[PDB]
Design a protein around this ligand. Structure first.
Ligand SMILES: O=c1cc[nH]c(=O)[nH]1
Ligand SMILES: O=c1cc[nH]c(=O)[nH]1
Ligand SMILES: O=c1cc[nH]c(=O)[nH]1
Ligand SMILES: O=c1cc[nH]c(=O)[nH]1
Ligand SMILES: O=c1cc[nH]c(=O)[nH]1
Lengths: 250, 250, 250, 250, 250, 250
């Protein structure tokens, strides 16, 4: 093993330079399935790695887990192995009324409501996505006739208080996040996810290209609930979208 | 007579939805003169405004003066009149060895080294440029075919210390900015300018679309003085890219 | 030229060490007109400089434009040129009930609500004015019988949100400033302006003497925008005392 | 079932109130193995739970995954199901020349080099461990004869930059952390780990009891080359410690 | 003398290594009178020191005056003199409804609402008590017989605004502290005092041991206000515990 | 007796509205000894108070103790009693090479390196002295005759690390203050003291008048700890000036 956590080697990558990176290990194989010669590489803790081919070039699909810390370990060690491009494919809840379930969200930059970001660049620095990656995502989305929304995302270190959830044990929200959802909504923020701020900031400040697409499972402002399924349809659409996007970046 | 500083009315814009905002009041005329039916509207303080037409579409060109404060006033009142799209065209200093004077830099998002951006959104909010605009600006630069670079831009509130300049009256740089240039370089920042952080933030926080393009007049690493035509040929050059970009955003 | 922005040479100042600095370039002439041998020197961007003589000694009048950024430029290059004493003179929105429009406010120190100041000194450093300069302004106002108020001033990097104006396009004010006006008021802050903070800080920390005075054109405890007629000789009181003050500082 | 991520019901916990919380999911069964009637509960994402018994009191063992974000979901949901006391057991790298590999570190409070804890309380708030837990841990540790150290530890949101490691892709570390390790050591901080800050803070500020113990696997000041069975032996001792400590907390 | 403020020489200590540091200089004698052979050493400013014997060992008792600044001097200089362990015995205002007047409160760590702590360690560092000292105080309380509460404490640099008291000259409280007491209560913080943050931080970051205990002379949630009882039984009650605790730290 | 720590009733001030506040309770007397009808009022903690008479006017002399915390208390409570003008007389350490021991220093505004000031105003608020108080102090200095310097002083919450002293127990200074002394020096700061930041901020933001004057007792650019005949005269000097400054503010 060349890296400490991912249990992989330079050779193991077969010369890959691009890595699709979901948060859940269970999703790694499904995605890799959409490409040629999908083989499992390794699996330690929350990082399950898989390799595949796309139009001749080899591509890596590895999980990050939840939060920027785990994410920063995958991105770091993956970069050490030759990875230069990172694409985030996830699921998220919309905080905007007009964004409806089934809509895909490409992120241009993120509100750094995390902590790992700061370990790579001062808060002044923008958690900005790579133009190429972002462009590729929007095009791959447009090509698959999807209802796409491009914009800012709020990347929180917590699933509850940072996303102003009160339905909790304490039932309280720290002063800083009290009333913060109305704020982000007013500023146009599209949704809450938990790893883009760290991914985008660490990459954008290290010469690595990153981008992020994400299917909308739920909506923090609507009342209706996901149809007769939730993840399933959209889930697989955003997945096809990121793979397609990967094609125009190799 | 409506807006307080610009001294303009709804009628003066003539239904204009998009405006080009250079920093220098003298560049306003030159840009409007590149379009159809250029007509001066007003000129107060550092805000001189003109109106023109692109493919039958009324377009505004209003200077902002130097810095985020004056820029925030121009943008606000312009939006009070109906503008929803803003394209900034300015001059800039590159801090990367490969970006020589004369190049065109399109800003995806900016390192917030100002103060006005904080009057619109907390530091954690990304001073990110609207996608459409950025896309239009990149394409336009590729149309006229110019050496172009896309990435982050450090937007300083000062021309000297903020951009780590030691050849000044006092010659000292406050701790926060000492060594900062090598940092921004190490992080791949492309250049220094003085209004993008405020422009991009106030717009992404209020539903306004904004793009940022700039011509390199100096390279903080290289050793040379404005050739002759240098800032002049550069300026008339980027002035074409942005107008050509706006054309795509009308 | 000797400097990059103002387009002046030390010779143009004729040994002048004091400069009266208005924000609006269209007042440089009006103010120089109250002194002897007024001679225009230049006009670049929002930097319009005129030279004159007071008691046989030369004095400079040069605009700074709106906000600390353009101001930091003006002061610096002007200081490189030889000015050691700067007296700002401007318009201002009072936030106290008793302060009437037309009254002159002398600023002892400013509430740093800008960004340029941080480029010269960490926030802990007071945006305090020079004692001699303040004294001269205070006494000049006494020998004129002008309704004078001297105290703390809030220097904002924006004219709208920063000064908590709600009559805007979005109509909202970021958290940092919601309810911020009544807070300053409770603290006895006299007014709102947009350059004293960065001016007083950059001077206080670089061996430069600075003074600040302004004429009240609107009372924020009544309205956000004035309807009041700007220029016969109403707020001229501020100018008269800034000249009379300069006279003493030569 | 009662929570969104863990996939548990209060019934599955059967009255348990104290949970041991390691990072690595594989150590959960191992911890449970040293207790009575242990049984697998559920496994979702990096959240692997097991329930066991001690002195006829039910105990829970749940993994938190790497980092505060992941941990904050486990702790909150564990608390929703009735857990009041949390004991984290983990691996760590000492920064003190006197703290050797294999030694056992008990944490009184952590340096908050994370972001999630802020989502529960402002920085001024101490990421401190409960006194009872800390006592049980120190006590339990003396009983099986380990070489113990009781103090503060640096809880970082990153494994690389935040722990000032330069053997990385970029080879750089933000200004914020350059020379930071030498400053923690100078301050007496014992080690680096990645979850105590969030755990300790969110518990101490919501009426939950929490403590932490760990074993040293690496010394950032030298070369006690990983003697491959070392992590094995060094871990069994802590695990017995955290269990013995838990016994005194039922 | 060997120090600048205390007026003490190493001889004066007679090999002593522990110090009981009350805030009131008049309490110094009262404390020493619970030991053997009390002897007044010196008195300069708010620094009154006495030496006594505790189970045969030399022990120092030195006042620190109110606030972190005075506290920082005493501890630094006492440390220069040879002291290694500090026990803080003070009075406080309980903020939890369940903590009654006369109760004894031991602090594990404090909320840093002071400024001196930052002169020893960044805000992210915890203001935590030494394990041995806190253990000694918990045991002494039990050996003495008292209602004791162990937990976090709010350490404010002021007695009024920083403790959200409103019956003051101004009757107003700065934004930072509005609704802050209600917030700490929600976080389980049990009380307000004015020197633990400094003491705990400066000791934990410099290798010195520190302990914090105080007597509740008032409860901010009840209308009843104790008469002489404040500096009476409650004071004497906490005074006996710290001396008793001290015996275990020799 | 009307206030909580000073042991004074409003009737005790005999209609006094101005108070001189030295940091050392032992000098209160010496100060009163310079006025008419000096009467000892009380002595509680570091708060020793006296009453005197100047030109048929009541004046109070009350020590505040070292630091903003105890200083904020004395001031607050003295204010509740009727005092609206506070003149502080202290001892300081010159940072500039030209300021000699024995020199009198009047403070215009000070660098806020304290914490109490934050309890009255945000950090951008200037710790600025009252104009009338500063004027009289400067005028009184001309009368008494002394080498005077009027400027910015750094008010530190600590005597050693905050003033970057290395003659300490640890011999090291926290990052924030490493090489901080020559930074203030290069910014023209003239001295280090420990109460003005709190005094000036709390008064200026609460509608109270305050001035600052202090006699230099050491020049840091040549030594860390005080010398030879000292305060015997320096103290008498500054006292003579502050007493004369008080005559001017009645
Ligand atoms: O160096 C430079 C050139 C142009 N504009 C800036 O702000 N800086
Ligand atoms: O209200 C006003 C008027 C002038 N300048 C400001 O900054 N505010
Ligand atoms: O050095 C080390 C070892 C384990 N875990 C960490 O966080 N750091
Ligand atoms: O409320 C109170 C009582 C005593 N001491 C404090 O600091 N606060
Ligand atoms: O050096 C010195 C002298 C007096 N007071 C201080 O705060 N520092």
């Amino acid at each position: 093993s060349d890296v400490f956590h991912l249990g992989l080697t330079k050779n193991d990558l077969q010369g890959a330079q691009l890595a699709i990176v979901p948060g859940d290990p269970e999703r790694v194989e499904k995605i890799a399935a959409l490409m040629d010669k999908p083989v499992k590489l390794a699996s330690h803790r929350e990082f399950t790695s898989w390799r595949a081919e796309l139009d001749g070039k080899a591509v890596i699909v590895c999980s990050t887990g939840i939060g920027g810390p785990s994410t920063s370990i995958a991105v770091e060690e993956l970069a050490q192995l030759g990875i230069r491009t990172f694409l985030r494919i996830g699921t998220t809840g919309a905080i905007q009324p007009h964004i409806n379930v089934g809509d895909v969200l490409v992120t241009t930059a993120s509100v750094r409501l995390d902590g790992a970001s700061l370990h790579f660049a001062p808060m002044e620095f923008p958690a900005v996505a790579d133009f190429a990656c972002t462009t590729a995502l929007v095009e791959a989305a447009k090509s698959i006739g999807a209802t796409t929304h491009v914009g800012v995302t709020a990347s929180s270190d917590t699933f509850y208080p940072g996303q102003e959830r009160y339905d909790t044990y304490s039932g309280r929200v720290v002063r800083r996040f009290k009333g913060s959802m109305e704020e982000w909504q007013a500023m146009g923020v599209m949704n809450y996810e938990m790893e883009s701020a760290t991914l985008l900031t660490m990459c954008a400040s290290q010469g690595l290209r990153a981008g992020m697409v994400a299917g909308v499972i739920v909506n923090r402002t609507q009342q209706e609930i996901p149809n007769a399924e939730t993840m399933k349809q959209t889930e697989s659409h955003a997945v096809k979208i990121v793979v397609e996007a990967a094609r125009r970046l190799l």
